[PDB]
Amino acid sequence: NQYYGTGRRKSSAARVFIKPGNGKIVINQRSLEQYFGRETARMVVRQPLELVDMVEKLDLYITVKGGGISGQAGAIRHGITRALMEYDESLRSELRKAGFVTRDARQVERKKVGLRKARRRPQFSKR
Amino acid sequence: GQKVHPNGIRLGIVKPWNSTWFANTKEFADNLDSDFKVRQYLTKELAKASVSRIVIERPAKSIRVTIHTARPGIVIGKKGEDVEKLRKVVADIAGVPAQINIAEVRKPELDAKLVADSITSQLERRVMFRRAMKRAVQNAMRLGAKGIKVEVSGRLGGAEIARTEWYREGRVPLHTLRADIDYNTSEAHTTYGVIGVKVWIFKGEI
Amino acid sequence: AKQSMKAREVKRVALADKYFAKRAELKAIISDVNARWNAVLKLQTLPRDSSPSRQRNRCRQTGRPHGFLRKFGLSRIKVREAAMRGEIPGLKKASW
């Protein structure tokens, strides 16, 4: 199988054409170094991309669709799980144990009537 | 005061919509006002005719109005003359070519609009409210509804302080969206005031 | 009730949509200068009710100034009543 992006997290679905080769992220046919290479939090989203420990011999081209950056990273991570499941199913126990196979169903709660946010309530005066 | 309207909460689940048509946002309001005016005319003309539900379907060339009447013969008239006159006036209210069909309502007490307007007419005729409510619930339980609730409300029996009396027979499970409960209202314009009768009839879980 | 307000709304719709909105439109597009003014004086002479800004959208059944919803054509209480009776087609309670 060609290793491809699967999986979902927040509002995202993943498009990574990860492959045998040295790992350097390329985004929209442009380098990650040009996009956000020295960005702080680019590391805290790059570690989830590698969190599956299946990036070490794998070159990466990433243009995941939808959501913000961390949700995109979670989608990439979940895709590397489901694709490595398609490659060999023996590593299912270790990915399940480390928590990568789980889709986090956490999503933004809706705003409610009489409430400024989903749960935040307007200030109450006793009098 | 704090309760959901049963037809509205079951509007997508069990109970059907009263008006079925598609119009765009340009014509939606004009159509809705035309539905209201057509409904108002044939309601006021055929209130003696025991009209219960009025279904207006527009195929956007024309208008097709189906009247669910317990007494079809008075609406139809002799040789269809009365329903033809109704079709003509409904045509000039709608502004489009018109069609009226009569769908009969078997088991007239089982219909929620009909029992409410019957209790209203008795309250206009100064029959006892308790007599009207007990007759409503007893006939429904005889005809075989699983339940019926009748609420009379306001100025009962010509008393200055208003009161709300509910007579309940059987099962009326309003929280179940599976259940079919026909809920309808009628208004008695008595000399002391206005009395509201609200009835629920529960027939089955669909 | 509020019969004078309803008749005034009929008056301004009749003066704006039918008698004018071609005369007033031509005078307005003249009044924006395209390369004391006569278009200004004529637009003054035209009735004030010919302005579509004068029209206040009111509920068709009741006549309420506030609460109007233009897709429905009715004020908020009447769209609730017609919603529960099923008169508005496709209107179901939203529970997302």
Added chain:
Amino acid sequence: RSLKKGPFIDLHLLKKVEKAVESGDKKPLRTWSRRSTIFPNMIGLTIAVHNGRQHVPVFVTDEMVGHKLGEFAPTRTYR
């Protein structure tokens, strides 16, 4: 703050001001309509804006041209 396509005056006020300047023998000119820019023609005339039942007479000078007539009339009273 307003359109540069034209200065705005009421037509009836323009007719009465041109009649007053042309005649040259005039009393204060009563205008209920307050939203009128003073023209240079008005200077030398007395024009009465609408406040309450009372009379607010403004004798327009050279400076008060670009302003509307209602600026010189006070609509409310306070201490």
Added chain:
Amino acid sequence: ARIAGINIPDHKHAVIALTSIYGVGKTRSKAILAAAGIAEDVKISELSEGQIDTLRDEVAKFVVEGDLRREISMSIKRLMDLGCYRGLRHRRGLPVRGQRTKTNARTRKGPRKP
């Protein structure tokens, strides 16, 4: 670089001193900055006659510094002599730009008088 004011640059921007002078706004500041095209946080030593003449001609071409007291006191004074209420309402001290005076306007009114 002092023209028609009380302010001078002191190893800082000319623009803040010019708008510190009343009667002008920051458009003079922005345009003088655009014409200068250099860092103004540098020292004010070797303050140039070119900078001084540009500032002088720019204020002379636009609204001059110190016309603000003029504009306020003209509206006040001419309508107080005429007797019209327009000058009187700006004499009272409250905001007549349309702003709410029911509980706000502490900037115009001052600290609260109980």
Added chain:
Amino acid sequence: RPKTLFEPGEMVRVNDGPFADFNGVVEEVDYEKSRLKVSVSIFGRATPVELDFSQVEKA
């Protein structure tokens, strides 16, 4: 060429099409759209349809 001149507001009825025995009045034609706008009754349903002389054969 049959009916080579094209006249706005001309009424043609297609017996083969669903618009047979249907009568309508065209108040507005959208010249700015460049497509003729008629509320044609189709399948017994009157909705505005954009149309062209090349698009529909004239009767």
Added chain:
Amino acid sequence: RIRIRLKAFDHRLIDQATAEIVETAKRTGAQVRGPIPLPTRKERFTVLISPHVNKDARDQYEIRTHLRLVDIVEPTEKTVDALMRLDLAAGVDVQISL
């Protein structure tokens, strides 16, 4: 090339009408692209439930316009002959295109 866009406030009527157009093209025996779902318009309205004074208590309503496109490859004259009143649905509005 014949383009039918069919919309309704109810999805069962939508599936019925698109099955009917598919049935007419299947009876004439032409290649039919399958019915493409097009995204639903959810028009939400928030309406105060009290006549005089309430702001927190308010109820929400949705009108949902379900949309389908058949995009049949081949039109024909026999379907043009049978076209008259083929939809027969007050619920669905159908727009034709060439």
Added chain:
RNA sequence: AAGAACCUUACCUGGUCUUGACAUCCACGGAAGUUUUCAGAGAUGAGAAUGUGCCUUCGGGAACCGUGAGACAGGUGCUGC
């Protein structure tokens, strides 16, 4: 109140009422309408030009408009005890 420049819009000035802004009748006259002038802050008046089509078993009928008396209207007036 999910929209106070005017309008919305009740509270200060000028104009109106037995048909009132708004429905129904009885009578008489006029198609409905369009376009202007003057005065006026103005629905208000005082004037002019064109259109009696449409139809009635024409012993003239329309949606209408103008006017008159009465029935009648009208009220976001009071009492949510």
Added chain:
RNA sequence: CCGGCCGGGAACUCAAAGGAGACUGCCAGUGAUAAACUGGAGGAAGGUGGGGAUGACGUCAAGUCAUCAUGGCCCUUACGACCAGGGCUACACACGUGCUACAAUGGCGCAUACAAAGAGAAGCGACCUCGCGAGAGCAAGCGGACCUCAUAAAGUGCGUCGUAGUCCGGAUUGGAGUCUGCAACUCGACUCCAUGAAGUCGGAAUCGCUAGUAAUCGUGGAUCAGAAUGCCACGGUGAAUAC
């Protein structure tokens, strides 16, 4: 044309119809051999998986005769009705609600990312030209998975500010374009250029929130000719703490 643009394909994202799945089903322990509770496998989801709608008999003669309808009472050449101007926007003050802050986890500049939900025909309006700009002129595509509103903002990568009353932005009549021209005076919004007030984190008290929650940062809608910091929705980053 290195734009899926274009043949093609429908493999994936996706749209939206129908299904499947979660039932303490299994396993252990406790408990009565019951209910249930505690853990464990499986599984994306585990014990109301999350959220919403749903508000029992009644209650407070709580709110609405000003949405409507309604009994009685009152006015009816006026308590009806029409227009102009005005008030609903005033101000010695005092609390309730939110907004902007009091900077350096921040400004300011230049370059670069990543959304979701919606609306749109008297409407949304690209492109181009003219404007510092709000905008104007010309004006394609669009009754919408197509076109437009609308090249999100926090995030940055570099610089610079290193007390600065700061871009934190208050303040009379200007210098303006747009809306309707009854018409922006009392009374609109917008880069407005007006003078750069107050505030160096707020006493006694008090409010909201247990996880995609608080906080923060943007976007859309309804109302609407114009006029939100309110209301209703949408996404992004994303805690801390429960003995």
